[PDB]
Design an enzyme around this catalytic site. Structure first.
Site: not given
Ligand SMILES: NC(=O)C1=CN([C@@H]2O[C@H](COP(=O)(O)OP(=O)(O)OC[C@H]3O[C@@H](n4cnc5c(N)ncnc54)[C@H](OP(=O)(O)O)[C@@H]3O)[C@@H](O)[C@H]2O)C=CC1
Lengths: 329, 327, 327, 329, 329, 327
Positions: F40, F85, F127, F167, F175
């Site tokens: 929320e 993730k 991945k 990525n 990162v």
């Protein structure tokens, strides 16, 4: 004596006919510490709480289809009497899944919860309609019976015994025929409904059934299906008794109805054991831990029956005339 | 007819299943035949033996409603044959039998209604008539559910009927193949439960054919019972192995000496036809049905008030030699 | 109108249920009236007292979504009256009350949307306004769900409205019948919780009639509140038993001295009509609605900024003698 | 003293405003052995793990709607603080079932898991919006409160105490109004959003709330709804404080909003007990095992309140001027 | 020695290839008190009961997707071997959710039930298709492996160890290629199906796999993925061995198939430890209670591997010629 | 085109989500954009930053099938971006990752089929190619489910495709932002897992654009892989913080040194286009598809037998300075 002192008892379907009588019996004749009623209806529980108004009583609103609720309610319980059920034969024919959920899954949940809480003894109520059944109600009870008997195979940190009590129609049962006729006769009594003229049934009183369950607790080893020796009565003689000068009317056989009932199937006589006033149908399966069902916990001896024994209501050796019935009401 | 129709069969990898699939592929124009069962091993093998584009295999459990809902999409006819049928094992694993047979029936019905299937036939057994064993009790519950499901009335009407017959000669895990194994294994004795044992016998092809005809006859709600022969178990062993002697191992958990297909208490509901019986529903549906006349215009008549189709008093008995012709 | 319509009522065997069914059978052309509740006993008895072909009984629990999905097939109007309503018992069995009242509301809504029901009215209570007891809290959650459900927009639009009123004179398990039992049982004292106790009172027939009119007025999203009289509990006991004295048993778990039907904090949402009030939704739907004009072209107006419909300051009070005329 | 040594604590919703402050408090002022954060978001947990980087911390990704996950996470826990919730009033009005699943079923699951794992003490966070509620959020919290209070009726092999802490708005709470205004003033501060001019609320700081929960743990018997005595502030004075020379704008009352909040309903005053700086609303129900809520575990004495007591934010005896607020930020 | 005396063992998927061989091994070489087979098919269980006819055997009909059933079946069990799975690569590609339910949720349920029943040691079977997987089957096994390894983080009243055994294709496995070719050669042997000519695989016998699992039980600390050193064989040489004078036929690569298999990913070599005849892939995560995987319970010493180690079937240092294969059948 | 279409995006409050929503609002005529996620807080904030009538927010979990069934009503396009993730956290909370990513995929697929959604695109990751970590394994299972779902054939055909890329520069919790935080926090050292670390890099805008084009190209069943540059992690830190030194913290749980987007073992399934690749399904659907020609009439060709799209041997490398232009 009184092998039930300081015990906590929980009865599913405690607000019903068997339930109220059973609760009254335990409160009056035993030293039980507490009695828990487990059922769904707040109306019946509110009225029962007032009617009994006994400090040893506890009421839990709950459904036997609800495992989590049962798990919680059975905490600290020593003995479980399972009387909850959908028992209306024609209604079960029209609502089969509902009857299945309550009677079959209900049995599975009660068993599961009793094992989880290390209950000591459990007795489930069966019915003669569960012997060679033709109607769904009876079929679900047969499944229930099989589940309770089979549950004795488990071996947890604590041992739980599961037995079954099977008897015929209960005189004046909630929603049964006796109350029905009494009402019709009270209104005007113009004509009494008769399914079939050949209709016969086993008959036991509420008190006899309740007392039988209690005594079964005292002599059970676990795994037994207890059957009491009871009288049979023709539906025609039943009517004339509840309304002497009143004309009957054939309405026809209702959905899933038998003309005569069976309590000990011919095909299972080889498992049956006879006693002074009751029978024991032994398990069809063998438990890892064998038991001798010929000698009850009360040291009562039993003998095998004939290779062609058949405990039916049509050829019973004992009956009840319209005069014997009135002596019950 | 199954002309350009899509049919799904639960338990399609079983004895009835494979025979049914073969019969549909060879004698009908069914456009697609779907096998729905759990075992990848049997499905892989069946796909090899039935390398036919008309086939489709779905790995799935009848205890899984969501899986059934998906698999029955676009299906016209559903044949429900999935079940746990070993009597002794069901006694020891009652809840497992209840989950598969009873809840399985409930899920199939639910998925069939959701996908607007036209016709559904569920396989019953004579062990479901006046049952004493758990297996039979679960099948009786299954039968009651399928018959009752006809009360539903959605956008697309779905008809649910039941087919009840006796022991299938040489079915997977049955006695016949077991006796053949012993005979071919040079057994010195044939295990007999009880010298009085009697059973109804129908061949796999007869069962499959009867199911196909039921599809053409059904209005929905019927329990179809074929007229089939009975046979004393003593004669069966004496035929499959006349030489080797027989030992008495005793009645197994939940067994009856004789089986019933139509209970005396259900006589009033039975209708007799030339080659079969219909046990009418014990309940009244929203919309009445006249079971005296099949969709094939076959006329049936009520049976005698004291009638009961039992294996001990059958007027038809399978000849120990005539049985070998079936094997 | 309910002309040739199919209506289903959850909790149809209750006080409101039976009165509603009778009213629909006698004053409308509804084609089918379905009763959905759990108890076979009450349904068997109700089927006998309402032996009418327009009736249909479904054994089912509102906690069972699959059962509701099935029962609501082909239904046009759903009246949701099933609930656990005993205040003290809900305090002791909070989760049970939550399952029935809250999850029950969720399941009914879900099943109604799935089956494309046209109109749905859920019964609320004044205990749901600024609630203090668990029962009232569950009904407030129920009301919020039904109002919110109007945001849905499927193939077939479904309207969900709520009807909120006070205590129903002589409802199943209520005080009135309880006092009648005592009086007819020669009781020497009448149990009174608190001398200050006040309540709104509506008759069973008035409640049923109001629900039927709400169906004709609703756009979906409204909480309908009828203009009804209040009555000091002291007067009620003095009427049902003027002789016998009254004892003070004390306030029961979760009780309020006075009930609210329209909270002051919700004043701005209220619209007053001649015989009733509408509490507008606190949320905005995908498609706007004008609650100032009912489907019956009735015009409503906003209430005073400080308005609050309470039982302690009602301008209408039920006469202790006029109450006997209701009994 | 320090009645929390070597204890393992699990806090649901530990990554939130209350959660982080509570975790910081326990780590800094107690001898607790381990603190477990239980919440759904991996982002917030990853950032919190870095921010705290304390070996006594453990993070479990999990939903309070997930009973099995809770059962697993609460293993070996001594104290459970339940702070997880959907708390946005207007959003709860639009997503009622979601608020119900998290707040109500979440409470039921936490209770269930705490009992299964024999947790010693449990404190659930309530809210003043749960007193005579009008919005769904408040209604779910009221249900939650009722569940936690009622859970004290259970009696397992181990005893678990369940209490509730109820207070007003938290100054600077995640997603609250204070941070909102500070941001608007930081951007340009052209006009401040005002629902209604009459708007009033109770105010407590994050530290005060956290400390109150901790002290509640030390004096609870189980079954109490603890309410702290806190100040009230008008929304208009709040705005002028967060933006002196900035014009306001009336946007109207949002969905399910009250003008004034209640902490102790007038209808429940008979259950309330007053103390030096806090109140205790006693259970409306009676437990099988009675308790004296007039004397806390800290030997603090409490007195019943007037028959017409009403702890509202509109007539509070203590308030906070724009200058008192700034002294918090 | 015989660190398995008086132990009760339950094996899921006990009716399969690995299962029957494993059960035979335990019954013949250990002093195990009881062996429980847990699987779904009544046909295979009925036939296995006859084939083994050993009083130490117990058969439970059940699905690993059924947590309640597993909870019941694992009662009183000391060791659990998890072999149940959907393993047909192409079928898993067409029925992904089914493979996911059995292999992944099955693992989760077995873990859950083993913890609830305080099982001592648990070994789950993995597969080389789970290393850098490309097919769904392998992906589910990888998830399974991760679940079992991670389960060692739990700390209940009783400690449960969870390890994994990963090896290549099993010669003559139920439904595998070897039995397939033998059958084709038995029928007519006109042409042997060949997916790709480059196809290579690791090969271990049923006995070697079973013995490896047993020895893994004796040296495991919990958390390990045991990998045995095994030979590799080209699919072309495999065919010529099962049918010398028979022409092959290229049918193409089936759905989700690799040309070569991996057992120890290059990216995980840093976690691998080498031993005389087996490897140990250490957990990627750290447990609250550290363990030294360099010294097994059998005091066997292991050494880290090279920074670029890659245990693949294409560059194995040991192989099997058509003559070495025949020496297995 | 998305002209007058309704689109729902699970995980709409995330990095990809917000960028996707902005792009759809500004470059298409989509009639309604629905955000489906649990928090929320993020939804309240996103509603403020995207105060646009085209927006609609649903609080919901992808682990909740009933909630998805409701939210996807009337939706034409579904973009599935919800997921757990964080690689290290998924290793420690494997079942949580499995529930969200795998069961979430199953529920979305199920709800999309039920509501007859036209197109669905699920976000995958590199991945998921030859995965070693739990996260990647769950995404591989997700990808397999979405591809397989194309076998379904209901009243309304639903196409399911997957978009797999590396990525995302500066994604939530990644990162890049982490390094920016350190640099702006006056950090004296930059944590580096391994000096050999390599990764594919795509910007948020590039990812969103690629997803939109996939919608225009897809037939259903494809795994779309964009041609994007690789970058040694050493260079990235040397760019975001040339001054401050770097420390070696070691490889984290479940990390690979280099990522794969198209496995060598799946080469035969790959089709190369000018700006992207399509990995064809490993299975054959009821109805064949020609992936060599996109819906945009773009022709693709098979790749080399030994082809593999890896980050260590990419022919395209992101310049440490050119990266700053993305930041
Ligand atoms: N065979 C090989 O080449 C290798 C296989 N493995 C693994 O080793 C294990 C055993 O393989 P293997 O003996 O060859 O395979 P099998 O197929 O011969 O055995 C699988 C067993 O699992 C049972 N099973 C399947 N689904 C379920 C379920 N849902 N619940 C309970 N039981 C179930 C089956 O019994 P039933 O159908 O009656 O339930 C069967 O007994 C598997 O986990 C496999 O992944 C790994 C490496 C080598």
């Amino acid at each position: 004596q009184n092998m039930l002192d300081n015990q906590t008892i929980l009865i599913t379907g405690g607000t019903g006919s068997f339930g109220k009588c059973f609760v009254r019996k335990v409160l009056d004749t035993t030293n039980a510490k507490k009695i828990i009623v487990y059922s769904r209806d707040e109306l019946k529980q509110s009225e029962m709480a007032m009617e009994f108004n006994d400090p040893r009583m506890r009421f839990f609103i709950g459904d036997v289809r609800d495992l989590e609720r049962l798990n919680y309610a059975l905490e600290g319980v020593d003995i479980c009497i399972h009387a909850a059920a959908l028992k209306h034969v024609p209604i079960a024919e029209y609502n089969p899944l509902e009857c299945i959920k309550t009677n079959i899954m209900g049995a599975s949940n009660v068993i599961n919860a009793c094992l989880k809480n290390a209950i000591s003894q459990v007795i489930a109520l069966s019915t003669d309609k569960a012997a060679n059944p033709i109607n769904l109600y009876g079929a679900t009870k047969l499944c229930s019976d099989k589940l309770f008997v089979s549950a004795n195979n488990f071996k947890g940190s604590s041992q739980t015994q599961f037995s079954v009590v099977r008897y015929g129609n209960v005189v004046g049962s909630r929603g049964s025929v006796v109350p029905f006729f009494k009402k019709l006769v009270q209104n005007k009594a113009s004509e009494i409904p008769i399914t079939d003229i050949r209709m016969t049934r086993f008959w036991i009183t509420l008190d006899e059934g309740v007392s039988f369950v209690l005594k079964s607790l005292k002599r059970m080893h676990g795994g037994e299906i207890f059957v009491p020796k009871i009288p049979s009565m023709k539906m025609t003689d039943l009517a004339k008794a509840l309304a002497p000068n009143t004309p009957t009317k054939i309405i026809g056989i209702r959905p899933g109805e038998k003309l005569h009932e069976v309590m000990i199937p011919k095909d299972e006589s080889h498992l049956a054991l006879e006693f002074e006033d009751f029978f024991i149908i032994q398990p069809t399966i063998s438990f890892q831990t064998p038991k001798d069902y010929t000698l009850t916990k009360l040291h009562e001896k039993g003998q095998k029956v004939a290779p062609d024994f058949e405990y039916s209501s049509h050829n019973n050796n004992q009956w009840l005339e319209p005069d014997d019935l009135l002596k019950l009401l």
